[PDB]
């Protein structure tokens, strides 16, 4: 709570990951090794290996899912569309993405009017349509975060409302489970940024 206040005063180009050039097989990369949150202060890694002749598979993973390599290798970016602190850029041409309209299903429509629907004056009336959007909708929608401010919350009553909420959640039970009892429905849904060039969650749930 306190850090949430005392961390407006400082600059905002000094939050985020840290980094440090590590040398793998006598080659240098950059890799995250901590964080600096606006609340939980500084937080240092604990298993950083200043060298390595070979990275395994778990490694390769947690190094290609990181911002540090992508960002630290990309052209600067200044974005005058938003207020949110941009950071870097990857491509050379920005991409503008749009949304198409629906499709009409005519035969249901004629069959719907035959029974006498859509008489001008009725009480049922088309209203839910497939709306379209132009080019820069993605980012003019991302922008809405500028409704999110730093907030201090009162504390001597948060430390009581948290008791009572916990009391609500009391009849239940839980714990860590092992990697052979998890359940995952629908195993062909995308895997997010750095990985969705190679396949869906399936492929990374096998290998």
């Amino acid at each position: 709570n306190f850090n949430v206040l005392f961390s407006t005063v400082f600059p905002p180009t000094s939050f985020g990951p840290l980094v440090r050039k590590i040398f793998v097989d006598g080659v240098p990369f950059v890799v995250s090794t901590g964080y600096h949150f606006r609340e939980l202060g500084v937080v240092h890694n604990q298993d950083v290996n200043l060298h390595s002749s070979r990275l395994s598979f778990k490694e390769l993973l947690v190094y290609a899912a990181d911002p540090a390599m992508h960002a630290a290798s990309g052209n600067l970016l200044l974005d005058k569309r938003t207020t949110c602190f941009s950071v870097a850029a990857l491509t050379n041409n920005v991409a503008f993405q749009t949304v198409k309209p629906g499709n009409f299903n005519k035969d249901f429509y004629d069959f719907a009017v035959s029974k006498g629907f859509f008489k001008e004056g009725s009480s049922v009336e088309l209203k839910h349509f497939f709306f379209a959007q132009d080019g820069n909708a993605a980012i003019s929608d991302y922008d809405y975060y500028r409704y999110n401010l730093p907030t201090m919350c009162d504390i001597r009553q948060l430390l009581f409302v948290v008791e009572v909420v916990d009391k609500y959640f009391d009849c239940y039970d839980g714990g860590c489970i092992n990697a052979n009892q998890v359940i995952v429905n629908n195993l062909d849904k995308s895997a997010g940024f750095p990985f969705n060039k190679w396949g869906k969650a399936r492929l990374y749930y096998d290998s």
Partner: protein
């Protein structure tokens, strides 16, 4: 718990992809939409109830047209039914009485 007549109608008329369109291929949507558009039948206002009955007659048309349609280019078609449960309400009614 009933929905919103405009919602059900709208979802009937506007689809994504030209395959959702053609109905015969996808008689499996209209069944679910009719499962959701049932409690409107007991409603007081009128045109509501007509939504349901529209949906039932529409499934009937879809089927009994697909069947003959595929009968011709064939030289037979549907012989064993009890699809006839799809277009009468005593199927859709099971799902709102407490037993399963």
């Amino acid at each position: 718990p009933y929905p919103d007549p405009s919602r059900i109608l709208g979802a009937g008329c506007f689809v994504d992809d030209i395959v959702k369109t053609d109905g015969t291929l996808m008689i499996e949507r209209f069944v679910s939409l009719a499962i959701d558009a049932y409690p409107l039948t007991k409603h007081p206002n009128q045109e509501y109830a007509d939504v349901f009955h529209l949906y039932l007659q529409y499934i009937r048309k879809l089927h009994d047209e697909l069947t003959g349609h595929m009968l011709d280019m064939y030289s037979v078609m549907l012989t064993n039914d009890n699809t006839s449960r799809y277009w009468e309400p005593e199927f859709y009614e099971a799902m709102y009485t407490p037993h399963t």
